[PDB]
Protein backbone atom coordinates (compact mmCIF):
# COMPACT_ATOMS: atom_id res chain seq x y z
CA UNK A 1 0.00 0.00 0.00
CA UNK A 2 2.61 2.50 -1.25
CA UNK A 3 1.01 5.74 0.12
CA UNK A 4 -1.55 5.95 -2.75
CA UNK A 5 -0.42 9.61 -3.00
CA UNK A 6 2.77 11.68 -3.54
CA UNK A 7 3.18 15.35 -2.53
CA UNK A 8 4.42 17.93 -5.06
CA UNK A 9 5.00 21.06 -2.93
CA UNK A 10 5.22 24.74 -3.99
CA UNK A 11 6.72 27.91 -2.42
CA UNK A 12 6.13 28.13 1.38
CA UNK A 13 4.90 24.51 1.73
CA UNK A 14 1.76 24.64 -0.45
CA UNK A 15 1.37 20.88 -0.83
CA UNK A 16 -0.43 19.44 -3.88
CA UNK A 17 -1.33 15.78 -3.17
CA UNK A 18 -1.17 13.72 -6.41
CA UNK A 19 -2.72 10.21 -6.50
CA UNK A 20 -0.15 7.37 -7.02
CA UNK A 21 -2.10 6.48 -10.17
CA UNK A 22 -1.14 9.90 -11.62
CA UNK A 23 2.26 10.02 -9.83
CA UNK A 24 3.53 6.93 -11.69
CA UNK A 25 3.00 8.77 -15.02
CA UNK A 26 6.06 10.79 -13.88
CA UNK A 27 9.05 8.39 -14.02
CA UNK A 28 10.75 11.23 -12.10
CA UNK A 29 8.41 10.77 -9.08
CA UNK A 30 8.87 6.97 -9.42
CA UNK A 31 12.67 7.45 -9.37
CA UNK A 32 12.71 10.08 -6.59
CA UNK A 33 10.65 7.92 -4.17
CA UNK A 34 13.12 5.02 -4.75
CA UNK A 35 16.46 6.88 -5.03
CA UNK A 36 16.88 9.50 -2.26
CA UNK A 37 14.03 7.66 -0.50
CA UNK A 38 15.20 8.79 2.93
CA UNK A 39 14.09 12.24 1.66
CA UNK A 40 11.82 12.31 -1.40
CA UNK A 41 9.43 9.64 -0.05
CA UNK A 42 6.55 10.68 -2.30
CA UNK A 43 7.59 14.29 -1.63
CA UNK A 44 8.93 16.77 -4.23
CA UNK A 45 9.40 20.20 -2.61
CA UNK A 46 9.87 22.75 -5.40
CA UNK A 47 9.80 25.30 -2.56
CA UNK A 48 10.29 28.29 -4.89
CA UNK A 49 7.91 27.52 -7.78
CA UNK A 50 4.49 29.10 -7.18
CA UNK A 51 1.32 27.15 -6.33
CA UNK A 52 -0.70 28.46 -9.30
CA UNK A 53 2.07 27.24 -11.65
CA UNK A 54 2.62 23.92 -9.87
CA UNK A 55 -1.19 23.42 -9.88
CA UNK A 56 -1.23 23.51 -13.70
CA UNK A 57 1.88 21.29 -13.96
CA UNK A 58 0.30 18.61 -11.72
CA UNK A 59 -3.13 19.16 -13.32
CA UNK A 60 -1.43 18.05 -16.56
CA UNK A 61 -0.53 14.76 -14.79
CA UNK A 62 -4.15 14.34 -13.61
CA UNK A 63 -5.36 15.26 -17.13
CA UNK A 64 -2.98 12.59 -18.51
CA UNK A 65 -4.45 10.03 -16.06
CA UNK A 66 -8.00 10.98 -17.15
CA UNK A 67 -6.98 10.83 -20.86
CA UNK A 68 -5.47 7.37 -20.23
CA UNK A 69 -8.57 6.12 -18.35
CA UNK A 70 -10.66 7.49 -21.23
CA UNK A 71 -8.31 5.65 -23.67
CA UNK A 72 -10.37 6.66 -26.76
CA UNK A 73 -8.63 10.10 -26.89
CA UNK A 74 -11.49 12.39 -25.76
CA UNK A 75 -14.60 11.91 -23.61
CA UNK A 76 -15.16 15.53 -22.47
CA UNK A 77 -11.39 16.10 -22.12
CA UNK A 78 -10.97 19.93 -22.43
CA UNK A 79 -8.29 21.83 -24.37
CA UNK A 80 -5.19 22.01 -22.11
CA UNK A 81 -4.80 25.81 -22.31
CA UNK A 82 -1.52 27.24 -20.93
CA UNK A 83 -1.49 31.07 -20.61
CA UNK A 84 1.84 32.71 -21.62
CA UNK A 85 2.38 33.93 -18.04
CA UNK A 86 2.31 30.27 -16.91
CA UNK A 87 4.72 28.94 -19.56
CA UNK A 88 7.65 31.04 -18.23
CA UNK A 89 7.82 29.15 -14.90
CA UNK A 90 5.65 26.16 -15.90
CA UNK A 91 8.56 25.15 -18.18
CA UNK A 92 10.73 24.47 -15.09
CA UNK A 93 7.94 22.71 -13.17
CA UNK A 94 7.22 20.60 -16.28
CA UNK A 95 10.94 19.82 -16.62
CA UNK A 96 11.13 18.68 -12.98
CA UNK A 97 7.89 16.66 -13.44
CA UNK A 98 9.39 15.13 -16.64
CA UNK A 99 6.67 12.77 -17.88
Amino acid sequence: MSQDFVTLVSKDDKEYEISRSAAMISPTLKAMIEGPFRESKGRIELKQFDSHILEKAVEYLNYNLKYSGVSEDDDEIPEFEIPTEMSLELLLAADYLSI
Binding site: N64, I82, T84, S87, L90, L91, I99
Partner: peptide
Protein backbone atom coordinates in the same frame (compact mmCIF):
# COMPACT_ATOMS: atom_id res chain seq x y z
CA UNK B 1 3.48 16.77 -24.18
CA UNK B 2 3.39 19.49 -21.48
CA UNK B 3 6.85 20.57 -22.67
CA UNK B 4 5.57 20.68 -26.28
CA UNK B 5 2.52 22.79 -25.30
CA UNK B 6 4.73 25.13 -23.25
CA UNK B 7 7.29 25.35 -26.09
CA UNK B 8 4.51 26.10 -28.63
CA UNK B 9 3.15 28.86 -26.36
CA UNK B 10 6.67 30.35 -25.84
CA UNK B 11 7.36 30.12 -29.60
CA UNK B 12 4.01 31.83 -30.30
CA UNK B 13 4.83 34.57 -27.75
CA UNK B 14 8.32 35.14 -29.23
CA UNK B 15 6.99 35.09 -32.83
Amino acid sequence: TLKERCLQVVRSLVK
